[PDB]
CSV table of C-alpha atoms and ligand atoms in Angstrom, one decimal:
chain,number,residue,atom,x,y,z
Y,1,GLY,CA,-24.9,1.7,5.4
Y,2,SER,CA,-24.2,5.4,4.3
Y,3,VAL,CA,-26.2,5.7,1.0
Y,4,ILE,CA,-25.5,8.7,-1.3
Y,5,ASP,CA,-28.0,9.8,-4.0
Y,6,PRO,CA,-26.4,10.1,-7.6
Y,7,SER,CA,-27.7,13.8,-7.9
Y,8,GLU,CA,-25.5,14.7,-4.8
Y,9,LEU,CA,-22.3,13.8,-6.7
Y,10,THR,CA,-20.6,16.0,-9.3
Y,11,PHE,CA,-18.0,14.4,-11.7
Y,12,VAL,CA,-15.1,16.8,-12.6
Y,13,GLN,CA,-12.2,14.8,-14.1
Y,14,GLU,CA,-11.0,11.2,-14.6
Y,15,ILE,CA,-7.8,10.7,-12.4
Y,16,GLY,CA,-7.4,6.9,-12.3
Y,17,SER,CA,-8.1,3.6,-14.2
Y,18,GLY,CA,-7.9,-0.1,-13.6
Y,19,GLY,CA,-12.7,0.3,-12.5
Y,20,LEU,CA,-12.2,4.1,-13.0
Y,21,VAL,CA,-11.3,6.8,-10.4
Y,22,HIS,CA,-12.8,10.3,-10.8
Y,23,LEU,CA,-12.1,13.6,-9.0
Y,24,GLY,CA,-15.4,15.1,-7.9
Y,25,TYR,CA,-17.6,16.9,-5.3
Y,26,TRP,CA,-20.2,15.7,-2.8
Y,27,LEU,CA,-23.1,18.2,-2.1
Y,28,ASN,CA,-21.0,20.9,-4.1
Y,29,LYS,CA,-18.6,21.3,-1.1
Y,30,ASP,CA,-16.1,18.4,-0.3
Y,31,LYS,CA,-13.4,17.2,-2.7
Y,32,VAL,CA,-14.1,13.4,-3.2
Y,33,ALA,CA,-12.5,10.5,-5.1
Y,34,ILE,CA,-15.2,8.4,-6.9
Y,35,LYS,CA,-14.4,4.7,-7.6
Y,36,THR,CA,-16.9,3.4,-10.3
Y,37,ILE,CA,-17.3,-0.3,-11.3
Y,38,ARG,CA,-16.1,-1.7,-14.7
Y,39,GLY,CA,-17.7,-6.0,-16.6
Y,40,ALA,CA,-15.4,-7.7,-14.1
Y,41,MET,CA,-15.9,-7.8,-10.2
Y,42,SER,CA,-19.2,-8.5,-8.5
Y,43,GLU,CA,-21.4,-5.6,-7.4
Y,44,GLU,CA,-22.2,-7.1,-3.9
Y,45,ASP,CA,-18.4,-7.9,-3.1
Y,46,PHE,CA,-17.6,-4.2,-4.1
Y,47,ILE,CA,-20.1,-3.1,-1.3
Y,48,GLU,CA,-19.0,-5.9,1.1
Y,49,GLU,CA,-15.5,-4.4,1.1
Y,50,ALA,CA,-16.9,-0.9,1.6
Y,51,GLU,CA,-18.8,-2.0,4.8
Y,52,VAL,CA,-15.5,-3.4,6.3
Y,53,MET,CA,-13.6,-0.2,5.4
Y,54,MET,CA,-16.3,2.0,7.1
Y,55,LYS,CA,-16.0,-0.1,10.3
Y,56,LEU,CA,-12.1,0.3,10.7
Y,57,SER,CA,-11.0,3.7,12.0
Y,58,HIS,CA,-7.3,4.6,12.0
Y,59,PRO,CA,-5.4,7.8,10.9
Y,60,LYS,CA,-3.3,5.7,8.5
Y,61,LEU,CA,-6.3,4.2,6.6
Y,62,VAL,CA,-8.4,5.8,3.8
Y,63,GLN,CA,-11.9,6.8,4.9
Y,64,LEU,CA,-15.1,6.5,2.9
Y,65,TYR,CA,-17.9,9.1,2.8
Y,66,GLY,CA,-20.6,6.7,1.5
Y,67,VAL,CA,-21.9,4.4,-1.3
Y,68,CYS,CA,-24.0,5.2,-4.5
Y,69,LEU,CA,-26.5,2.3,-5.1
Y,70,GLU,CA,-29.4,3.9,-7.1
Y,71,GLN,CA,-27.9,4.2,-10.7
Y,72,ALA,CA,-25.6,1.6,-12.4
Y,73,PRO,CA,-22.5,1.7,-12.6
Y,74,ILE,CA,-22.4,1.8,-8.8
Y,75,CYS,CA,-19.6,3.8,-7.0
Y,76,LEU,CA,-17.7,4.3,-3.7
Y,77,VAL,CA,-17.2,7.9,-2.4
Y,78,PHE,CA,-13.7,8.2,-0.9
Y,79,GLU,CA,-11.9,11.1,0.7
Y,80,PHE,CA,-9.7,13.0,-1.8
Y,81,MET,CA,-5.9,12.4,-1.3
Y,82,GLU,CA,-4.0,15.5,-2.8
Y,83,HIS,CA,-0.9,13.7,-4.1
Y,84,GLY,CA,-2.6,10.4,-5.1
Y,85,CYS,CA,-0.9,7.0,-5.7
Y,86,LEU,CA,2.4,6.4,-3.7
Y,87,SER,CA,4.2,4.5,-6.5
Y,88,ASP,CA,3.5,7.3,-9.0
Y,89,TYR,CA,4.4,10.0,-6.4
Y,90,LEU,CA,7.8,8.4,-5.8
Y,91,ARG,CA,8.6,8.3,-9.6
Y,92,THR,CA,7.5,12.0,-10.2
Y,93,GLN,CA,9.5,13.4,-7.2
Y,94,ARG,CA,12.5,11.0,-7.7
Y,95,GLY,CA,15.8,12.4,-6.5
Y,96,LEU,CA,14.1,15.0,-4.2
Y,97,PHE,CA,13.5,12.6,-1.3
Y,98,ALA,CA,15.7,12.2,1.8
Y,99,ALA,CA,16.4,8.9,3.7
Y,100,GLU,CA,14.4,10.2,6.7
Y,101,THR,CA,11.3,11.1,4.5
Y,102,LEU,CA,11.3,7.6,2.9
Y,103,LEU,CA,11.6,5.8,6.3
Y,104,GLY,CA,8.7,8.1,7.6
Y,105,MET,CA,6.5,6.8,4.7
Y,106,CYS,CA,7.3,3.1,5.7
Y,107,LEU,CA,6.3,3.9,9.3
Y,108,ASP,CA,2.9,5.3,8.1
Y,109,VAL,CA,2.1,2.1,6.2
Y,110,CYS,CA,3.3,-0.1,9.2
Y,111,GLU,CA,1.0,2.0,11.6
Y,112,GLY,CA,-2.1,1.2,9.5
Y,113,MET,CA,-1.1,-2.5,9.1
Y,114,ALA,CA,-0.5,-2.9,12.9
Y,115,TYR,CA,-4.2,-1.8,13.4
Y,116,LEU,CA,-5.4,-4.3,10.8
Y,117,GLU,CA,-3.3,-7.1,12.4
Y,118,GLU,CA,-4.9,-6.5,15.8
Y,119,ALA,CA,-8.4,-6.3,14.2
Y,120,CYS,CA,-7.6,-9.6,12.4
Y,121,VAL,CA,-8.0,-8.2,8.8
Y,122,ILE,CA,-5.8,-9.5,5.9
Y,123,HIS,CA,-5.0,-7.0,3.2
Y,124,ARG,CA,-4.2,-9.7,0.5
Y,125,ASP,CA,-2.8,-7.1,-2.0
Y,126,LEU,CA,-0.4,-4.7,-0.1
Y,127,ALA,CA,1.6,-2.6,-2.6
Y,128,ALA,CA,2.8,1.0,-3.3
Y,129,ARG,CA,0.1,1.2,-5.9
Y,130,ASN,CA,-2.6,0.6,-3.2
Y,131,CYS,CA,-1.1,3.4,-0.9
Y,132,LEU,CA,-2.2,7.1,-1.1
Y,133,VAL,CA,-0.4,10.3,-0.4
Y,134,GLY,CA,-2.2,13.2,1.3
Y,135,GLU,CA,-1.2,16.6,2.7
Y,136,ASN,CA,2.3,17.0,4.4
Y,137,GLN,CA,3.4,13.6,2.8
Y,138,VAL,CA,1.0,11.5,5.0
Y,139,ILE,CA,0.6,7.9,3.7
Y,140,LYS,CA,-2.7,6.0,4.0
Y,141,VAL,CA,-3.5,2.3,3.2
Y,142,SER,CA,-6.3,1.7,0.7
Y,143,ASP,CA,-8.0,-1.5,-0.8
Y,144,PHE,CA,-8.0,-3.2,2.7
Y,145,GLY,CA,-11.7,-4.2,2.4
Y,146,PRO,CA,0.3,-10.2,-8.7
Y,147,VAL,CA,3.0,-12.7,-7.5
Y,148,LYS,CA,5.8,-10.1,-7.1
Y,149,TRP,CA,4.3,-8.9,-3.7
Y,150,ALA,CA,3.1,-12.5,-2.8
Y,151,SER,CA,4.8,-14.8,-0.2
Y,152,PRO,CA,5.7,-18.5,-0.9
Y,153,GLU,CA,2.5,-19.6,1.0
Y,154,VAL,CA,0.4,-17.4,-1.3
Y,155,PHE,CA,1.8,-18.2,-4.8
Y,156,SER,CA,1.9,-22.0,-4.1
Y,157,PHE,CA,-0.8,-22.9,-1.5
Y,158,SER,CA,-2.8,-19.6,-1.2
Y,159,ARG,CA,-2.4,-19.4,2.6
Y,160,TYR,CA,-3.3,-15.9,3.7
Y,161,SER,CA,-2.3,-14.5,7.1
Y,162,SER,CA,-0.9,-11.4,8.9
Y,163,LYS,CA,2.6,-12.8,8.2
Y,164,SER,CA,1.9,-13.0,4.4
Y,165,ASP,CA,1.2,-9.2,4.4
Y,166,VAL,CA,4.6,-8.7,6.2
Y,167,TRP,CA,6.3,-10.2,3.1
Y,168,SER,CA,4.2,-7.7,1.0
Y,169,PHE,CA,5.3,-4.8,3.3
Y,170,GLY,CA,9.0,-5.9,2.7
Y,171,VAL,CA,8.4,-5.5,-1.1
Y,172,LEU,CA,6.5,-2.2,-0.4
Y,173,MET,CA,9.6,-1.0,1.6
Y,174,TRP,CA,11.8,-1.8,-1.4
Y,175,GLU,CA,9.5,0.3,-3.7
Y,176,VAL,CA,9.8,3.4,-1.4
Y,177,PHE,CA,13.6,3.4,-0.9
Y,178,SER,CA,14.2,2.7,-4.7
Y,179,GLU,CA,11.8,5.7,-5.4
Y,180,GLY,CA,9.0,3.9,-7.3
Y,181,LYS,CA,11.0,1.2,-9.0
Y,182,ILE,CA,9.1,-1.9,-10.4
Y,183,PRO,CA,9.9,-5.1,-8.4
Y,184,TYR,CA,11.3,-8.0,-10.6
Y,185,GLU,CA,11.1,-6.0,-13.9
Y,186,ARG,CA,10.4,-10.9,-15.7
Y,187,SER,CA,7.3,-13.1,-16.0
Y,188,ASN,CA,5.1,-14.6,-13.1
Y,189,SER,CA,6.5,-18.2,-13.1
Y,190,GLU,CA,10.1,-16.9,-13.6
Y,191,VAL,CA,9.9,-14.9,-10.3
Y,192,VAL,CA,7.9,-17.6,-8.4
Y,193,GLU,CA,10.8,-20.1,-9.1
Y,194,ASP,CA,13.5,-17.4,-8.4
Y,195,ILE,CA,12.2,-16.7,-4.9
Y,196,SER,CA,12.2,-20.4,-3.9
Y,197,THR,CA,15.8,-20.8,-5.2
Y,198,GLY,CA,16.9,-18.0,-2.7
Y,199,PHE,CA,16.9,-14.9,-4.9
Y,200,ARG,CA,15.4,-11.7,-3.3
Y,201,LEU,CA,15.2,-7.9,-4.4
Y,202,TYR,CA,18.6,-6.0,-4.5
Y,203,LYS,CA,19.6,-3.3,-1.9
Y,204,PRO,CA,18.4,0.2,-2.9
Y,205,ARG,CA,21.0,3.1,-2.8
Y,206,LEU,CA,18.8,5.2,-0.3
Y,207,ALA,CA,18.2,2.3,2.1
Y,208,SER,CA,20.8,1.6,4.9
Y,209,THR,CA,22.1,-1.7,6.3
Y,210,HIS,CA,19.6,-1.7,9.2
Y,211,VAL,CA,16.7,-0.8,6.8
Y,212,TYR,CA,17.6,-3.7,4.3
Y,213,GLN,CA,18.0,-6.1,7.3
Y,214,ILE,CA,14.3,-5.5,8.3
Y,215,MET,CA,13.3,-6.1,4.6
Y,216,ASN,CA,15.1,-9.5,4.7
Y,217,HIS,CA,13.3,-10.4,8.0
Y,218,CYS,CA,10.0,-9.7,6.2
Y,219,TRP,CA,11.4,-11.9,3.3
Y,220,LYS,CA,12.0,-15.0,5.5
Y,221,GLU,CA,10.9,-18.4,4.0
Y,222,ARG,CA,8.8,-19.4,7.0
Y,223,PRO,CA,5.8,-17.2,8.2
Y,224,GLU,CA,6.7,-17.8,11.9
Y,225,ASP,CA,10.3,-16.4,11.4
Y,226,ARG,CA,8.8,-13.1,10.0
Y,227,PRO,CA,8.2,-10.3,12.6
Y,228,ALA,CA,4.6,-9.1,13.3
Y,229,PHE,CA,3.6,-5.5,12.3
Y,230,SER,CA,3.5,-4.5,16.0
Y,231,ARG,CA,7.2,-5.5,16.4
Y,232,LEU,CA,8.2,-4.0,12.9
Y,233,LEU,CA,6.8,-0.6,14.0
Y,234,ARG,CA,9.1,-0.4,17.0
Y,235,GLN,CA,12.1,-1.7,15.0
Y,236,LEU,CA,11.5,1.0,12.2
Y,237,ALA,CA,11.1,3.7,14.9
Y,238,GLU,CA,14.5,2.8,16.4
Y,239,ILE,CA,16.3,3.6,13.1
Y,240,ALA,CA,14.5,7.0,12.8
Y,241,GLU,CA,15.6,7.9,16.4
Y,242,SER,CA,19.3,7.1,15.7
Y,243,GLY,CA,20.3,6.3,12.1
K,301,0G2,C1,-1.3,15.0,-8.5
K,301,0G2,C2,-2.2,13.9,-8.0
K,301,0G2,C3,-3.5,13.8,-8.8
K,301,0G2,O1,-3.3,13.7,-10.2
K,301,0G2,C4,-4.3,15.0,-8.5
K,301,0G2,C5,-5.7,15.0,-9.3
K,301,0G2,C6,-4.3,12.5,-8.3
K,301,0G2,C7,-4.3,11.4,-9.1
K,301,0G2,C8,-5.0,10.3,-8.6
K,301,0G2,C9,-5.7,10.3,-7.4
K,301,0G2,C10,-6.4,9.4,-6.7
K,301,0G2,C11,-6.7,9.9,-5.5
K,301,0G2,C12,-7.5,9.3,-4.5
K,301,0G2,N1,-8.0,9.8,-3.4
K,301,0G2,N2,-8.6,9.0,-2.7
K,301,0G2,C13,-8.6,7.8,-3.4
K,301,0G2,C14,-9.1,6.5,-3.2
K,301,0G2,C15,-8.8,5.7,-4.2
K,301,0G2,C16,-9.1,4.3,-4.4
K,301,0G2,C17,-8.9,3.7,-5.6
K,301,0G2,C18,-9.2,2.3,-5.7
K,301,0G2,C19,-9.7,1.6,-4.6
K,301,0G2,C20,-9.9,2.3,-3.4
K,301,0G2,C21,-9.6,3.6,-3.3
K,301,0G2,S1,-7.9,6.5,-5.4
K,301,0G2,C22,-7.9,8.0,-4.5
K,301,0G2,N3,-6.3,11.2,-5.4
K,301,0G2,C23,-5.6,11.4,-6.6
K,301,0G2,C24,-4.9,12.5,-7.0
């Protein structure tokens, strides 16, 4: 449920585009991020994803205040994340990040994805662009309600599972350690044929041998050979404890 009246919301500034993302206030008190509809995408599916997001509670997942239904275009009322999009945050603060900080960001994404794995929810589009940065560099997973991030089962047979999101997490891990670099920067059919041949993303300078090894385990051809998010969480924690 959670229905918000349009008069309660106050639009301040446009902060994102795709629909549009606006910085605003709810009841003239709380800082909120308002996601308005474009056109493309169904109005019911946009609300169906919001109902799923409001039922999943984890400190590493973005929380929703409510939904505006009365006036069209309809909108989602999200909590405001101070530093915004992860991919953009990595590019702006490039060269200022330490290896420990970048690994800490990957552990935050893996925490939220381990919760979704147990709750049997497939993300379908896990990327650095769909991750948000809050206060004290805390990373939260969004849009949990593009073949570069897709696994061989997805771009050829459209088989979605928890192991296909593991492949996406491997590509996400590459974006973090490369400090916001575009993966396979190359057309869709060019990369889809490159992956099957045996070509993967190169080793980033900031990432270590143990970090890149975990990325390749996520990049395994067979879904069964890839480790689960629950296992990956403990493997990433072992690197942070030692080096
Ligand atoms: C310096 C970062 C800043 O420029 C500050 C205004 C910025 C830019 C963009 C965003 C977006 C957010 C944000 N907070 N919470 C959400 C949820 C979002 C969302 C978008 C699409 C689908 C689902 C959720 S975007 C967002 N905070 C920002 C902060």
